[PDB]
Amino acid sequence: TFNYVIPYGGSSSYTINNEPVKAEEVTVDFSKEPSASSLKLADKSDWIAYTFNNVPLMATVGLLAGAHEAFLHYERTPIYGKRTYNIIKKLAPIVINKTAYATLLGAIFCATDALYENYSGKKSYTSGMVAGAATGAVFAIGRPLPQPLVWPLVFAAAPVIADLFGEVYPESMKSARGYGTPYGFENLDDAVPTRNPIRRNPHHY
């Protein structure tokens, strides 16, 4: 509008609808559909099965963190000096405890997520926030005063970010194309394509 008299923007009639028209005559897709393994892992019906499918990620991360710390210790120990203590007896607790505590946190997260979704019956932000809150509460059992508040908040915030930018964001902008005519505006005279552009093939790595 760019004037001080009438409101900016505009309005669209709710009664009037515009027939969908295809962005191109022939559609060639280079985006592959979800695999059956992805649908299997995403399935939260059985909370035990959902937990056991998704924990290997957490155990892997804990193992890398423990291996990093254990190597930092091993690198320091002197080879030239013979050591009275056994190095692996020193180093194994590091890796084992890191992996175990990581797996326990991930197990709480996944189990609470699946249990809340089953009980609620709906897929929602709240399941992730509650699972994260429980995981952060387990993180800060005996920790000093700011941490009982901050860790539930951070661990709850993480699934919100994952949902917002992993699921809502892609689905909100599926229709936008960038070629031919703007998705809302097909009445405008822009070059109309026979085929959509293929900038790359379906990946296979």
């Binding site: 001080y4 909100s172 960038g178």
Partner: protein
């Protein structure tokens, strides 16, 4: 329009060829000539052309420049207040920095391309980092604060502009586009949230004002805060109205919370520049909320109240800078007896403080009446909330005035002839707008 843009480009150009001893005089003449070119742009802007008074393009979508109601008011305001900044600042380095900042800011206001707006507005990022972090009287922390806040908000705005350019094919305002996406709406919104100081993203403004020079503070308060409303009327409301109407309860929550907590934070200030800087934050919320109603009253009232703020807060900052030159202190507790010691400075200080409290014979009154009327058009409680908590401003303004007014002092600290020349235009403009020539 073309003359105004040419003169805006001429001012930084002249500094390269001046003798480096004639720099101040040439800069002042260039500033006044730019003001006259802005008056010419107003003359050649016909009200018959209702959508845009003037549009000029220089070969690309980025080079598309145009003036509307908001743009014309803000550009005249910056061109009006720049000469005062020029006289207040000494040295080729400082003159160069301030001229480049003003050129970038004034080109941003008239730009009609979101990407060009972003490019011109953020070109003044290091210049404030250097300016606020100057050797002896600057603070690196404040420069870091302002630079980081601006960078994050402007990068979000840039991402939204990229998405619009990909989807629509254009990001120029003159091409009608509408979007219902909330991610892009937030990307455009975050810049406004930060640039117009709105709680909790208001922390950069105080530290910047206190540790910026008086000319820098005058520009920052006068027009850089108003750049938010140019962005809102030009680049957010035309395209992102659905999201502002969807989020209106949240928008009101954040705006009224900013008003209240900024008013309360002002009460805990002992530094005069910090008092004025926090008054600015409380003043911005009414502007932001009145525009967000997307009504004829709200837009006009917001631009009017921006003009009122850009005539009142530069005056307070200028007076405080003069007092700091005379006294080498900004603490209210050190400053006493200013009524007896500086009658001429005290008169103007009281006049401008009355203006900041929105008394009838001041432009802030008319502007506030219009904004409150727009809020009342939305709902009665909306206006009632703002009207009541305006009393908090009276408490801190009255406490500051009472502390400064009387006591025992052994120093005559009153303004010189140069200082009075510096504020005379602002006083005249304040009076002229107050009687209704808004």
């Amino acid at each position: 329009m073309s003359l105004y843009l040419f003169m805006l480009f001429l001012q930084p150009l002249s500094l390269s060829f001046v003798s480096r001893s004639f720099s101040k005089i040439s800069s002042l003449m260039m500033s006044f000539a730019t003001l006259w070119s802005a008056v010419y742009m107003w003359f050649t802007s016909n009200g018959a052309n209702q959508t845009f008074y003037q549009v000029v393009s220089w070969g690309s979508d980025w080079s598309t420049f145009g003036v509307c109601y908001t743009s014309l008011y803000i550009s005249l305001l910056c061109a009006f207040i720049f000469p005062i900044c020029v006289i207040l600042v000494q040295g080729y380095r400082a003159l160069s920095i301030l001229i480049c900042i003003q050129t970038a800011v004034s080109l941003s206001i008239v730009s009609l391309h979101m990407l060009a707006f972003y490019a011109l507005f953020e070109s003044s990022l290091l210049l404030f980092f250097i300016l606020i972090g100057r050797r002896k009287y600057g603070s690196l922390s404040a420069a870091y604060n302002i630079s980081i806040y601006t960078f994050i908000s402007a990068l979000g705005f840039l991402i939204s502009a990229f998405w619009l350019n990909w989807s629509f094919g254009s990001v120029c305002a003159l091409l009608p586009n509408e979007e219902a996406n909330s991610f892009v709406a937030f990307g455009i919104f975050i810049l406004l949230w930060v640039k117009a100081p709105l709680v909790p993203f208001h922390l950069w403004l105080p530290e910047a004002h206190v540790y910026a020079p008086t000319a820098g503070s005058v520009l920052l308060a006068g027009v850089l805060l108003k750049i938010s409303i140019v962005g809102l009327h030009v680049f957010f409301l035309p395209i992102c109205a659905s999201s502002i109407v969807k989020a209106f309860p949240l928008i009101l929550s954040i705006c009224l919370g900013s008003f209240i907590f900024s008013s309360f934070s002002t009460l805990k200030q002992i530094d005069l520049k910090k008092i004025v800087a926090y008054s600015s934050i409380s003043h911005m919320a009414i502007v932001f909320l009145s525009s967000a109603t997307n009504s004829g009253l709200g837009i006009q009232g917001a631009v009017l109240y921006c003009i009122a703020h850009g005539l009142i807060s530069p005056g307070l900052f200028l007076l405080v800078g003069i007092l700091y030159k005379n006294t080498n202190t900004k603490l209210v507790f050190y400053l006493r007896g200013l009524s007896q010691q500086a009658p001429v400075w005290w008169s103007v200080w009281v006049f401008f403080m009355l203006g900041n409290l929105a008394f009838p014979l001041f432009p802030n009154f008319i502007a506030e009446v219009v904004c409150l009327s727009a809020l009342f058009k939305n709902h009665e409680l909306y206006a009632y909330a703002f009207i009541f908590f305006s009393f908090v401003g009276t408490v801190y303004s009255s406490t500051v005035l009472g502390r400064l007014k009387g006591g025992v002092s052994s120093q005559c600290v009153d303004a010189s002839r140069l200082d009075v020349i510096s504020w005379n235009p602002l006083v005249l403009a304040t009076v002229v707008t107050g009687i209704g020539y808004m």
